[PDB]
């Protein structure tokens, strides 16, 4: 027929936006699930990396299009809020964008699509929450089983009977039965080479990676300590500007050495006047953290020194110990010191790590550090990642209590209900919600295909079994078919499914609303 | 007068572009909503306006859609003068660039 | 040297080319001729966007290497300095004469015969123009003041100032009178300075008969005003280019101390010199201190304690404005300060203008002044700049009306009368010159026709009406409808141009036409 | 494997002579419209981005600076005319051009450049004898001194913007030349200054030097403005303490001296002003600024100051007042002072200007041009220049010939008459030479807008009847007796111009090769 | 031929068109921002590292330069509306563009 | 200023009409009068003729332009009604078209 001439074509931008964004999602889609396919990337440095981790892939895909990049931010939001599902939030975004593209071709204005999808997302969340299996923080074993599940897909699963309760106790030490938001950044995972995977500890004050003092005269241990955090360097005067010292004999060398030593002595005496017992110096390569000459003075003062402490360790210390940074020896005073019952260096299988316990300070906050041990780098790196993910699982359970079955089950349950319920809606409401619900099946569809199963057969079985059955049914790659995934212990926190529904709506809403790209120069 | 007649009508045509853009951005058929709205305001009922949430015509007093008188004076005043500034231009002269 | 890479034009082709070059210039500025003329966007070397219809500004901002066009710019410069009115008309008319010259040359009339004919035609045009003149300053002084204001009001109507021009017309009238004595009737434009600030509206503008500084006081606690002090001799002002303190450098000091005895004295010297310098102000008998430089803290306290208000960091011209207005001197040092150097005024005070924080300092004589400043306000820079420049034009009009009382009616009426006179005389020549005399008259017609075109009027019906009315009814000046008034006949509309303005416009445009017509060879080299 | 040139150019043969002629004609074409009192002006844009407008052939050709190695000969010979005679530079190039134009077809017909040049050399000798015979030795016969000089300037100003105002400007020119030394009249001693405003007839004649009055600074004007018998002192140094532009830092060895430095600088200027007072000057000039302290001091000492004086004026002031300029103030003697009969301030141009007047020692004068536009004032200056030159020459050199082409036509006649007896190829060259002489009355008519064909034909008939002084009349399109009409120029102008035009003609035609070294 | 030194020159037909096309180009920046359901514009600087999305018409007009010297006039006028009044920036810019579009 | 744009440009036809017709009229113009100048014409068949007869010139001019050929009909009507002035009527037409 004859219709809108469409001389000005804003749809050309939205089409470019959707095409670019969906391309990113389809690339990630094929890596979904324990049976997913690997991606290989050649980096700008020429290195070859292989991974099936969606977020790691997305960062290295080096997406250019200003709008397609937003799908990377979505995975970052998922990693920040939930810590899991980072691949699934982009995949659902891609499928929902495909729904939007079809709806646009059907004559639905992008404004209608964005708002209607938001309404569908609201109902999707309600459907998800009602169907979950509730948990309680009071049930320590239940928390261990939740962590143990996420640990069963790690490289060294034989120690999951240890890493699970470690993650559980680490959270419980700082989060009681009545908590909403737990920031697991207060649970510091500290690695050190040596020992074994089970050989871990939970420390209240801090675990540091560095030694204290090895030289003669050092106290090596202090009880009832006040602790300061140093960001300055303690070294003889060493300016950057032009300077010269002339020494023609040992007599002048003696004078010069006394000038250098007296400088450090005055610093060390002021530190003593502040009644500081332990110095924790932030790592820097500008000047010596604490010069040997200063260590001789500080040792005689019975002051412990820990050097080359990483920024991240310093930031944790400022919360666990109740102590404050000192920017310069000029301002080094008591008001900036914390407290601790015991500061000691532990040498276990050559560890030699300084730790603090018994802070008992009003400035302290519920923090905990975990000692990760292991012979090979792969052991301490795998353990840290394993505990981190386990902590993210528990954090999710606090924010929104409960787990749902995996294997695409909540996507079949939500889609199935929405497709039926949408039939009672009017106008664009029903037509759009049918496309929204259909988009959700990209997850159980992809899981079936990556598992080597017939795509239509599995989804057909999932539809039929959910109509007669319940959420517990889903795809099990271990059983290579549709079975009771709850009984197979394939469980994900509610927050992961809830967040994915939200992010998919927010991203598509954001993409559809962009009708132009302009430069600001 | 004759010559100025089309300019006055053109001014009105510009004024009715805002409710057209409002409907279009809301994803509604602006041609229907704007044409019907005009017939409502023309044939008395001067209370009606766009319902940019339901996609229909509604009584703005019942919905509570009001805008400051002072602001509307500023918008009309600024738009009128803003056009005049460029209406008075028919030549662009540039000096040597630096 | 380096004969190559040069341009040259000569001969009959140069005559066509040169006239076309003149036409190109006119084809731009002609569009701004008239009270309803259209504006230009003028783009500075830095990309600054300004809008104006001032032909003098436009031609000044037109940067060109066409030597014939440059001659037209020189014409507009002469008119802008001498009269200040016809800066567009003299170029448009000169082009119209050159356009007529083109046809005359093509028909076989020698450029010299054209130049001579145009000169004689100009003499006829002025001879008739005199017959239509009248006096404004004649008879009752009240009529002079009435017409003087009305002339300013009309001149303002071509710029944005037209919105509230009633106030700016008054400023022009008061400004020209305030610097002019009734007996001599000579106006020195330099006695009327223009100044303005961003903020407020143009309706807030006013004429200030004193000196205004865009500077604050040296210390926030220092008194903001000095009054005559209950009948004393006004306010005594100390105007200097040096601060009342031991001067200190901003670069190197190089002050060598050879002994402890000197060290202790040197620290004391500075503290004491601060006191001595302020004490010298009291010895002079000054009330306020105006310096090119600011003051140190010790000087501010000493000036504060002794009730000696002081203004900091006052610029060169600002110091001269005070010295001139107050009939004083600018004294480089302090030892010469006395009643014979200090300036006198009636009041110095700080004036606030609504929410504008400029807080300008105004020095008043509260009596007849030798100089005035026109204070312009407005909601933006371009508004102030244009309204301020609008006063410049109006000041030029009232300047010319004071100097030469003879005026003629404008709106193109003068050009139609002169065109008719030259046309009627052309038929009496019976010789070759008849072609140039008719051409000259046709060139004059281009002005009322331009006023028609720039107003949206038919220039053919308009000119037909203009000539018909001045032949069928009475030679009396008949104007155009360019102002949107109920009818023409400027006698009731008060659109009046000075005689000396219209006389120079016609003579100078004719002289310029001859300046270009006599050019038979142009050689252009490079630019180093 | 070898070549002869490697970027070395040389071109030889008759074709080079013709090529040299063509380039030289181009120079003539640039200058041909400048001939005559109605000559057209030329616009030249120089490398300095200034534009020059003039119909003076010397000005135009000096700025043209034709590059072509052969045409530069026309530049050189024109400069020789400008140095040896001071006028006629336009006519030298034109005559040289036409002679070379006629040489071209002679070369084509196989006539050697020697035979062409030989005939020209003979033809010049024949012409010069006639020019001398035609010359009149006349001064104040049946007239007086000012009566001749008035007619001379009045003629020069005919048909100019100041035609009707000749009664005013003619006096200025006659007075200007008569104010000079009567043994050596130097145009450089007559200064011309442009002041905008007023009518042209209001122009002023000054015996001394005028100034531009560059002062705008507050506190000025409060000094005496008039002196009866002033002593005049000129300095090369400034007299100011604190300018509106400059400044200084204060650096001391002692804190107490901080304020002293400001007053010390005051003393340094004061002491210089005091030594001027010791000299005993009444007016003090400087090329550099003179500030407020100097004005206040001088005023209280009854001394007038004027600074920022143009460098050219400072030298002319010394030439007017008979003093001597000094750079320092400590070493000045009363013998360095000049004297005037009057110092006054004028209202010329409706603006105040300073001037000296009635300087007893003056060898110069100043002409002030008024008018409603700079372009008109420029036209007045050009008219005054020509009027001054003809007054100068009429007073200086009593041996005259008729102008307006009258001499060229009488010379043309006698050259044709000689051809009646000159046999052989020489007959062809003497005819061409005579033809060249006719280009002057021709281009005078054409530049004036006259029917050159009609006027030239009438001139030929007039001279054939023995009317030896008739030429082109520029007030009425006809011919008339230029001697009776006082349209004169010194005989040496025609003798030297014709000799010079031929010298350039023969030198150019004598060249059969050009060599150029490039690299 | 006059002017020179590579300056921009537009005469009646060109400058008049530019005045209107420019104002339209300004309107095109903010016509999508009108109403609570307006659409977003994605803005990105030369560095690529400042990419942002906004529907604030004032931000867009201030952030996005135009090379049309007549468009610069209307943008500057819209700035005054935004800074002095605090609202109506889009409405004035649209109405100005539409008034000139019809003109 | 600015005025009607007239996107469709029939003025281009009117210009071409006057330009072509005036060119024909200016050509024949030089043959007016007992002292008029002759024309040479090489015809399409290769025969070259010299004549000052106005009609013969226009007839052998081989005018193609759809409007300029009207001047041939003008000279025919002049010859048909008057029998003289066949040059003058064409010259006048050209001058009026220039007007």
């Amino acid at each position: 027929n004859a219709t809108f001439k469409n001389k000005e074509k804003p749809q050309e931008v939205r089409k470019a936006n959707i095409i670019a964004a969906r391309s990113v999602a389809d690339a990630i889609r094929t890596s979904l699930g324990p049976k997913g396919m690997d991606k290989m990337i050649k980096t700008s440095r020429g290195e070859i990396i292989i991974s099936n981790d969606g977020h790691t892939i997305l960062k290295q895909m080096a997406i250019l299009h200003p709008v397609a990049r937003m799908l990377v931010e979505v995975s970052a939001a998922q990693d920040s809020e939930a810590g899991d599902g980072t691949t699934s939030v982009v995949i659902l975004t891609g499928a929902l964008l495909g729904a939007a593209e079809r709806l646009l071709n059907k004559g639905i204005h992008p404004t209608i699509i964005a708002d209607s999808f938001q309404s569908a997302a609201k109902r999707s969340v309600d459907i998800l929450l009602e169907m979950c299996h509730k948990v309680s923080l009071s049930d320590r074993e239940q928390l261990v089983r939740a962590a143990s599940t996420s640990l069963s897909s790690k490289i060294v699963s034989q120690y999951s009977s240890f890493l699970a309760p470690l993650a559980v106790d680490s959270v419980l030490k700082i989060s009681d039965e009545n908590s909403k938001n737990v920031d697991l950044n207060d649970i510091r995972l500290v690695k050190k080479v040596g020992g074994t995977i089970d050989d871990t500890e939970m420390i209240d004050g801090v675990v540091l990676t560095q030694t204290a003092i090895k030289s003669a005269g050092g106290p090596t241990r202090k009880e009832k300590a006040k602790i300061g955090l140093i960001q300055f360097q303690i070294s003889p005067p060493k300016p950057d500007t032009e300077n010269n010292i002339i020494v023609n004999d040992y007599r002048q060398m003696d004078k010069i050495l006394k000038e250098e030593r007296a400088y450090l002595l005055n610093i060390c005496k002021k530190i003593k006047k502040a009644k500081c017992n332990v110095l924790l110096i932030q790592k820097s390569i500008l000047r010596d953290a604490v010069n040997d000459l200063a260590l001789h003075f500080l040792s005689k003062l019975n002051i412990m020194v820990v050097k080359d402490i990483e920024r991240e360790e310093i930031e944790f210390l400022s919360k666990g110990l109740g102590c404050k940074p000192i920017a310069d020896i000029e301002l080094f005073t008591e008001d900036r010191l914390g407290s601790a019952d015991l500061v000691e260096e532990i040498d276990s299988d050559g560890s030699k790590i300084v730790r603090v316990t018994g802070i008992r300070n009003n400035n302290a906050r519920p923090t905990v550090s975990v000692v990760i041990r292991g012979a090979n780098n792969m052991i301490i790196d795998e353990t840290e990642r394993s505990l981190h993910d386990a902590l993210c699982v528990i954090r999710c359970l606090v924010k929104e209590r409960g787990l749902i079955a995996g294997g695409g089950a909540p996507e079949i349950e939500i889609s199935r209900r929405l497709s039926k319920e949408a039939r009672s809606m009017e106008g664009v409401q029903a037509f759009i919600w049918q496309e929204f619900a259909s988009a959700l099946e990209v997850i159980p569809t992809t899981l079936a295909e990556n598992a080597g199963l017939n795509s239509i057969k599995v989804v057909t079985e999932l539809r039929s079994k959910h109509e007669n059955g319940e959420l517990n049914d889903g795809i099990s790659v271990r059983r290579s078919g549709t079975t009771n995934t709850y009984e197979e212990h394939i469980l994900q926190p509610v927050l992961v499914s809830t967040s994915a529904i939200t992010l998919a709506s927010e991203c598509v809403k954001s993409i559809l609303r962009i009708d132009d790209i302009a430069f600001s120069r | 007068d004759g010559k100025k007649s089309l300019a006055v009508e053109a001014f009105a045509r510009a004024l009715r572009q805002l409710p057209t853009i409002l409907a279009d951005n809301a994803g509604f058929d602006s041609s229907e909503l704007v044409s019907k709205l005009r017939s409502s305001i023309y044939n008395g009922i001067s209370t009606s306006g766009l319902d940019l949430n339901n996609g229909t015509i509604a009584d703005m007093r019942q919905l509570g859609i009001v805008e400051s008188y002072k602001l509307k004076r500023a918008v009309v005043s600024s738009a009128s003068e803003a056009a005049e500034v460029l209406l008075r231009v028919d030549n662009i002269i540039r000096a040597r660039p630096r | 040297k380096d004969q190559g890479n040069k341009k040259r034009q000569h001969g009959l082709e140069a005559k066509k080319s040169h006239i076309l070059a003149a036409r190109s210039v006119a084809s731009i500025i002609k569009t701004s001729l008239g009270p309803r003329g259209l504006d230009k966007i003028l783009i500075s070397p830095d990309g600054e966007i300004t809008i104006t219809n001032d032909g003098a500004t436009i031609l000044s901002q037109m940067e060109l290497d066409n030597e014939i066009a440059k001659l037209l710019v020189q014409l507009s410069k002469s008119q802008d300095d001498e009269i200040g009115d016809g800066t567009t008309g003299v170029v448009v008319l000169a082009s119209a004469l050159l356009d007529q010259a083109l046809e005359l040359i093509q028909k076989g009339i020698h450029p010299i015969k054209i130049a001579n004919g145009f000169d004689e035609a100009a003499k006829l045009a002025i001879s008739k123009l005199e017959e239509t003149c009248d006096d404004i300053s004649a008879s009752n002084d009240e009529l002079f003041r009435d017409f003087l204001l009305r002339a300013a009001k009309t001149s303002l109507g071509s710029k944005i100032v037209s919105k509230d021009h009633d106030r700016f017309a008054e400023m022009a009238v008061e400004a020209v009178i305030n610097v002019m004595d009734k007996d001599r009737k000579d106006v020195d434009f330099d006695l009327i300075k223009m100044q303005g600030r961003v903020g407020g509206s143009i309706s807030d503008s006013k004429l200030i008969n004193g000196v205004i500084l865009d500077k604050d006081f040296s210390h926030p606690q220092m008194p903001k005003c000095v009054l005559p002090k209950e009948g004393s001799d006004g306010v005594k002002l100390a105007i200097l280019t040096c601060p009342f303190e031991p001067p200190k450098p901003k670069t190197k000091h190089k002050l060598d101390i050879s002994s402890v005895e000197e060290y202790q004295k040197l620290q004391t010297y500075e503290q004491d010199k601060f006191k001595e310098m302020i004490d010298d102000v009291k010895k002079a008998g000054a009330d306020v201190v105006i310096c090119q430089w600011g003051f140190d803290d010790e000087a501010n306290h000493l000036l504060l304690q002794n009730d000696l208000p002081a203004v900091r960091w006052v610029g060169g011209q600002e110091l001269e404005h005070i010295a001139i207005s107050t009939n004083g001197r600018i004294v480089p040092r302090f030892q010469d300060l006395s009643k014979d150097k200090l300036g006198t005024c009636s009041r110095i005070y700080e004036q606030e203008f609504g929410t504008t924080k400029d807080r300008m300092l105004i020095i008043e004589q509260s009596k007849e002044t030798k100089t005035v400043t026109c204070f312009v306000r407005g909601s933006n820079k371009m508004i102030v700049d244009e309204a301020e420049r609008a006063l410049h034009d109006s000041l030029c009009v009232v300047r010319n009306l004071v100097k030469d009382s003879r005026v003629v009616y404008g709106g193109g009426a003068a050009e139609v009368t002169m065109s008719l006179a030259v046309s009627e005389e052309a038929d009496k020549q019976r010789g070759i010159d008849q072609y140039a005399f008719r051409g000259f008259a046709q060139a004059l017609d281009t002005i009322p026709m331009t006023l028609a075109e720039n107003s949206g009027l038919d220039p053919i019906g308009t000119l037909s009406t203009l000539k018909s009315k001045q032949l069928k009814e009475k030679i009396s000046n008949i104007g155009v409808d360019c102002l949107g008034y109920g009818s023409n006949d400027m006698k009731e509309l008060f659109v009046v141009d000075p005689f000396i303005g219209k006389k120079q416009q016609i003579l100078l445009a004719t002289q310029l036409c001859r300046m270009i017509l006599k050019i038979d060879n142009v050689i252009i080299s490079g630019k180093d | 494997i070898v070549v002869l040139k490697e970027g070395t150019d040389a071109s030889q043969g008759k074709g080079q002579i013709i090529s040299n002629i063509n380039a030289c004609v181009a120079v003539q074409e640039a200058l041909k419209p400048t001939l005559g009192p109605l000559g057209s002006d030329i616009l030249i844009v120089t490398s300095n981005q200034k534009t020059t407008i003039s119909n003076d052939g010397a000005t135009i050709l000096k700025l043209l600076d034709v590059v072509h190695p052969a045409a530069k000969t026309l530049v050189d010979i024109s400069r020789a005319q400008d140095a040896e005679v001071g006028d006629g530079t336009t006519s030298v190039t034109i005559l040289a051009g036409e002679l070379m134009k006629e040489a071209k077809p002679f070369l084509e017909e196989g006539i050697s450049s020697h035979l062409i040049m030989k005939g020209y050399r003979k033809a010049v000798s024949l012409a010069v004898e006639k020019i001398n015979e035609l010359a009149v030795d006349i001064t104040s016969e049946k007239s007086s001194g000012r009566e001749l000089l008035e007619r001379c300037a009045r003629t020069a100003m005919s048909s100019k913007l100041i035609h009707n105002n000749a009664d005013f400007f003619v006096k200025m020119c006659v007075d200007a030349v008569l104010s000079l030394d009567r043994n050596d009249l130097d145009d450089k001693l007559i200064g011309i200054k442009k002041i905008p405003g007023g009518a042209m007839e209001e122009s002023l004649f000054i015996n001394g030097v005028a100034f531009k009055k560059t002062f705008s600074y507050a506190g000025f004007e409060q000094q005496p403005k008039k002196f009866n018998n002033p002593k005049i002192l000129s300095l090369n140094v400034e007299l100011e303490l604190k300018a509106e532009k400059d400044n200084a830092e204060v650096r001391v060895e002692h804190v107490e001296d901080y304020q002293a430095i400001v007053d010390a600088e005051w003393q340094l200027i004061f002491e210089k002003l005091r030594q001027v007072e010791e000299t005993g000057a009444n007016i003090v000039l400087s090329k550099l600024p003179i500030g407020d302290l100097a004005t206040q001091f001088f005023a209280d000492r009854n001394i007038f100051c004027a600074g920022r004086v143009s460098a050219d004026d400072m030298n002319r002031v010394i030439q007017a007042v008979g003093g001597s300029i000094q750079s320092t103030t400590s070493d000045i003697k009363p013998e360095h002072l000049g004297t005037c009969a009057l110092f006054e301030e004028m209202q010329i141009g409706s603006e105040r200007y300073n001037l000296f007047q009635g300087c007893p020692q003056a060898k110069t004068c100043t002409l002030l041009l008024r008018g409603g536009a700079e372009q008109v004032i420029a036209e007045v200056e050009r008219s005054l220049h020509d009027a001054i030159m003809i007054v100068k020459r009429a007073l200086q050199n009593k041996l005259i010939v008729a102008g307006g082409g009258a001499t060229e036509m009488e010379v043309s006649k006698c050259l044709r008459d000689y051809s009646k007896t000159i046999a052989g190829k020489q007959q062809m060259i003497i005819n061409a030479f005579a033809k060249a002489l006719e280009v002057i009355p021709r281009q005078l008519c054409e530049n004036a807008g006259f029917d050159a064909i009609e006027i030239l034909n009438k001139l030929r008939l007039a001279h054939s009847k023995g009317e030896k002084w008739y030429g082109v009349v520029f007030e009425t399109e006809n011919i008339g007796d230029n001697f009776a009409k006082f349209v004169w120029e010194p005989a040496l102008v025609k003798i030297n111009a014709l000799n010079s035009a031929t010298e350039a003609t023969n030198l150019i035609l004598s060249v059969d090769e050009t060599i150029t070294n490039k690299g | 031929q006059i002017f020179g030194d590579q300056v921009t020159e537009e005469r009646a037909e060109n400058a008049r068109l530019s005045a209107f096309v420019g104002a339209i180009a300004v309107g095109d920046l903010v016509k999508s921002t009108l109403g609570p359901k307006g659409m977003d514009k994605l803005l990105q600087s030369a560095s690529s590292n400042t990419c942002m999305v906004t529907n604030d018409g004032a931000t867009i007009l201030k952030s996005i330069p135009l090379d049309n010297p007549a468009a610069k006039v209307l943008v500057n006028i819209s700035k005054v509306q935004d800074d002095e009044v605090g609202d109506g920036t889009t409405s004035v810019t649209v109405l100005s563009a539409e008034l000139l579009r019809e003109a």
Side-chain angles (χ1 to χ4, degrees), chain B residues 5-79:
Chain B
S5 181
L6 293 175
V8 171
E9 288 180 327
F11 196 89
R13 288 198 291 270
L15 290 173
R16 291 194 287 267
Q17 296 302 307
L18 288 172
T20 300
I21 291 168
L22 284 171
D24 283 344
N25 284 343
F28 301 127
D29 183 322
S30 63
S31 293
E32 180 179 358
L33 288 173
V34 172
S35 297
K36 287 181 171 175
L37 178 59
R38 185 178 184 273
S39 70
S40 178
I41 300 301
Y42 186 79
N43 294 316
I45 297 169
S46 297
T47 66
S48 65
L50 298 175
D51 180 336
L52 296 176
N53 295 288
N54 291 291
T56 189
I57 304 301
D59 183 298
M60 294 299 95
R61 292 174 182 172
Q62 292 180 338
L63 273 58
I65 309 303
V66 298
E67 296 183 86
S68 175
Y69 172 78
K70 184 173 184 294
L71 180 57
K72 290 291 184 186
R73 288 288 301 273
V75 168
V76 173
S77 296
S78 292

Side-chain angles (χ1 to χ4, degrees), chain E residues 1 8 10-11 20 33 40 51 58 64 73 76 79 84:
Chain E
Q1 181 71 62
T8 299
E10 299 184 14
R11 300 292 183 90
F20 294 119
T33 64
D40 300 330
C51 181
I64 302 302
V73 174
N76 286 340
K79 180 179 190 297
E84 295 295 309

Side-chain angles (χ1 to χ4, degrees), chain C residues 64-313:
Chain C
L64 56 81
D65 286 332
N66 182 305
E67 291 301 309
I68 299 302
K70 288 182 182 176
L71 290 172
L72 289 174
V73 172
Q74 290 177 358
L75 172 63
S76 69
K77 182 64 165 62
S78 295
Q79 188 64 0
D80 192 61
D81 291 346
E82 184 68 18
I83 304 298
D85 61 351
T87 60
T88 302
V90 296
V91 174
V92 171
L93 178 57
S95 179
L97 290 170
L98 291 169
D99 284 342
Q100 289 287 332
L102 179 61
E103 290 180 356
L104 290 170
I105 291 168
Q106 291 172 338
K107 291 178 179 178
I109 309 299
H110 194 281
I112 290 170
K113 292 177 183 177
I114 296 169
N116 288 340
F118 282 170
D119 189 74
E120 290 295 308
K123 288 182 174 65
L124 292 175
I126 297 304
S127 295
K128 188 70 179 177
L129 187 62
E130 289 178 354
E131 291 186 359
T132 62
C133 295
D134 204 353
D135 286 321
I136 298 301
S137 68
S139 190
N140 192 324
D141 288 346
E142 290 179 353
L143 292 172
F144 175 77
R145 289 178 180 172
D146 183 22
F147 286 120
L148 187 64
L149 180 62
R150 289 176 184 272
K153 287 173 66 71
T154 298
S155 67
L156 294 169
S158 64
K159 292 180 173 68
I160 196 169
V161 73
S162 66
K163 177 179 181 291
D164 298 317
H165 68 280
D166 288 345
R167 184 60 174 162
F168 291 87
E170 290 173 354
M171 291 169 66
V173 169
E174 290 178 355
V176 73
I177 292 168
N178 286 339
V179 300
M180 175 273 288
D181 64 277
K182 188 174 181 179
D183 293 347
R184 186 174 172 178
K185 300 179 175 60
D186 285 340
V187 177
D188 180 349
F189 190 93
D190 195 52
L191 296 176
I192 304 170
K193 300 297 186 184
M194 279 76 73
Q195 186 176 13
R197 304 287 293 183
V198 175
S201 67
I202 63 170
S203 72
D204 297 316
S205 303
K206 63 180 182 179
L207 183 67
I208 301 172
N209 294 330
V211 177
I212 306 94
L213 277 63
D214 288 320
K215 303 291 175 183
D216 58 8
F217 282 94
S218 69
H219 185 55
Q221 293 171 324
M222 193 168 288
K224 298 293 192 62
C225 181
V226 180
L227 304 178
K229 298 183 183 178
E230 299 185 355
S232 298
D233 189 19
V235 182
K236 301 294 174 178
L237 299 82
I239 304 93
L240 291 93
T241 57
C242 179
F244 286 82
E245 61 187 56
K248 292 181 277 192
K250 302 297 183 183
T251 57
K252 301 293 184 182
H253 296 82
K254 299 186 180 293
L255 198 165
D256 291 347
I257 303 90
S258 66
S259 66
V260 172
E261 182 178 359
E262 286 177 349
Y263 182 81
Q264 292 177 334
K265 291 179 181 178
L266 291 166
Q267 288 180 309
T268 299
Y269 286 171
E270 183 177 0
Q271 291 178 35
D272 285 349
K273 288 299 180 185
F274 271 108
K275 182 180 186 294
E276 289 179 356
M277 291 298 293
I278 277 56
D279 285 345
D280 287 321
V281 175
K282 290 187 287 187
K283 291 176 183 177
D287 294 294
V288 299
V289 177
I290 307 94
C291 294
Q292 184 176 43
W293 293 75
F295 299 84
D296 208 335
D297 285 346
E298 289 294 309
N300 283 319
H301 285 307
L302 290 165
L303 290 167
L304 179 62
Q305 289 175 333
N306 290 283
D307 195 24
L308 298 167
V311 183
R312 60 176 176 175
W313 297 113

Side-chain angles (χ1 to χ4, degrees), chain D residues 347-364:
Chain D
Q347 296 180 61
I348 292 301
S350 302
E351 184 174 0
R352 292 184 183 274
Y353 293 95
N354 299 310
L355 63 161
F356 285 111
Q357 179 67 281
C359 301
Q361 300 298 305
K363 302 296 183 182
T364 66

